[PDB]
């Protein structure tokens, strides 16, 4: 998974909250959901 294709994951884990861009965390390393929750900020 990488950029463009990966937006559905943050839409999944954040819902109707929105997010800011950054792919370097799972295009090369692994998406462990730990960064994904903090990527979207209320």
């Amino acid at each position: 998974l990488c950029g463009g294709e990966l937006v559905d994951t943050l839409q999944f884990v954040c819902g109707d909250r929105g997010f800011y861009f950054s792919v370097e965390e799972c295009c090369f390393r692994s998406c462990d959901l730990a960064l994904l929750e903090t990527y979207c900020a209320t």
């Binding site: 994951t9 999944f12 884990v13 998406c31 462990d32 730990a34 994904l36």
Partner: protein, 816 residues
Amino acid sequence: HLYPGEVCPGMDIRNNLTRLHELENCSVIEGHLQILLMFKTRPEDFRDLSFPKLIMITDYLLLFRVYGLESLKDLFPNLTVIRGSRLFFNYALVIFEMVHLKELGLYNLMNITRGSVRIEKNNELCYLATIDWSRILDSVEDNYIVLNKDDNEECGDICPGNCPATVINGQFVERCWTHSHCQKVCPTICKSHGCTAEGLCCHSECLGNCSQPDDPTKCVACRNFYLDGRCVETCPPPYYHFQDWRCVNFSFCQDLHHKCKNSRRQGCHQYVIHNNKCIPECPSGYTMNSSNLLCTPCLGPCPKVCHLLEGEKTIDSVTSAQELRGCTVINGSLIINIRGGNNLAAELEANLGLIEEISGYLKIRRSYALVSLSFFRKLRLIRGETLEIGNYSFYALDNQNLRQLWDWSKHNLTITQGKLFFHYNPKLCLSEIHKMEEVSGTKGRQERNDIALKTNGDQASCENELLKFSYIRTSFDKILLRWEPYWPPDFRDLLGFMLFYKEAPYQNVTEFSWTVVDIDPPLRSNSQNHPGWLMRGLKPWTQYAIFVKTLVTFSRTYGAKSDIIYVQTDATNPSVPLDPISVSNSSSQIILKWKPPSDPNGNITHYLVFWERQAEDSELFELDYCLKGLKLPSRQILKELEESSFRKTFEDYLHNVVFVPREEHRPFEKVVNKESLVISGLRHFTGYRIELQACNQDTPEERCSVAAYVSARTMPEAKADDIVGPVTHEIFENNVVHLMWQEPKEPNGLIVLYEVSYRRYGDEELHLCVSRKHFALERGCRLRGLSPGNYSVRIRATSLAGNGSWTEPTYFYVTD
């Protein structure tokens, strides 16, 4: 019929066949028969011996190394039923080391009341797999038949069958005893009551076989009891049941007791009477009364002691436990060791469970089939006077399947001396052991390395600390997981959670495939952060079984797990319908076939299929097909554990040292509940583009799959390519013949060329190509230079399908 003959209580024959004549008058045996240890015998010595009188065996039959015996069909031709009152190592019929045996021959065996059959190490016996033990025994799974000639070799089981046959796993097979006789199988309406040769049901009380159906007077073996031939289910007084197979008058029991009393035989029993039963000794609570042989209840709670030789007893078989039947106080110690593979809970509960106090210790070692100790129904106190070596009162060693020790909602226990001992009980857990310690009252009687923490329950999830799931919801393709945080008393010992997930077809799945994923422990929130985890990849619309288990270092262990929670993924867009094939059979009928997609991903509501009309290929109009080359188409992990521990142990050292105290409308149809479709009304010899696609959701917006493209072509008509209309010709001054003919407005696709053959009387046939441009620019054909005379003209139309029929010879006369 009655049993004419001496009862001849059980005996054994050894070392010579001359001792086999004691059964000359024997219809029943009130004991066990053992024919074994025959070395100086030959098959020529066995052709004469036969015992048609023997009918019924009470205890068991054992054969062990009888040389020269090839078949029992001549030895016991009437062995009907074996009671199995007392077994030989929980086996009612043992055939061991049976050299020279070929076929069993017991073609008269009907029922075995209690026990099992073990035949092994014969090396010569076949005709074994051609038998049905289900109609013979009551628990086939308890049998043990291996190491015979049947498996390692291929002795042909040739037998009539004619004879009845039945299924065992998935196929029928004849059930034959020998090459001349076969197992008697009759309808199930007579479960065990017996049935004659024709098929009439015997009497209900009868068992196995009978002569006159529905007549107990003419039976051969009746299940309940026996008296004077005409047996009854329960004989009335003054007849008292004897040895659970017959009843006799009080005089018989009285004189038998007197005979045992006056003749001090070491094996005789002082038979008493208790509830119309001449039993060897009535149980606890009764006293042997000199006046009347019946034992009246006593005015005092005196139990029936059970003295044990050398203060020990090994319980390894049903017959071993049967010696303690009726006993309630053991004056010794019990060592249960059941090397098995089949559970013995029922018989152990039948024999044991009436005992209350054990003078010595109770030891359970190497037992395998034991799933629980619940068969000790009335076990109350363990005195432990004869303490086990090492000063123990309870033992447990290498019990592979010891799941539960006791039900402590109701049960009670008491241990006077000694200490518990548990080791290598993978199915037993420390919770039950601590409950043992609390209930018994020996809490202050424990030392180190008496209850190993890492051996008991090592592969049984029993930390008994439950974990909840905070919130979860599954989306179009994936699923997110989240659960409440957990923390041991020392938070550094939590190394992260283990997540288990697998696809569960039905609602039930075994607890502890099973793919796992490592979870990093969450940061110390000290607002609390839920750990959670995101899955990666799955098969949609499947029932998924998910649960999480903590992983904490062994320092006490305080792990946690969650309940098996089933989460159902939603549905999605289906795949292309598998194998799209279309076949045409009639002029307007085209049949298209397809299979459901490999992953339906949705209840297929309907199929949206479109058939579309196309125009002829553009390059076809601009291609000439009379030029040469006119081929027109016929269209490993311990280091990580220590690294956490090593990091922890340095932190503890540092603290200790530093701190110090002070849409185009293509015709379509919604094909519903059908993997096929037939379409009508199609033009002749015209192709079709078929767009095939499937939808699995209609009312909440059409969730439809991708399109599938297949090509279908129809066969032409019969006389569509033939040229119709008169062949008008215009003749100029130069005798130029300009042919007029009306084209087939509805042809087989398109007519590419024409063939004109005009022949004069005595002349030959000529040919000319009339292409589409030739037919258009010249408005037909234009013949030039025709010799004088009347020509017979035939025109052939060449269409896409092929050459049309020759037109009828047309005659035109030019001036000579």
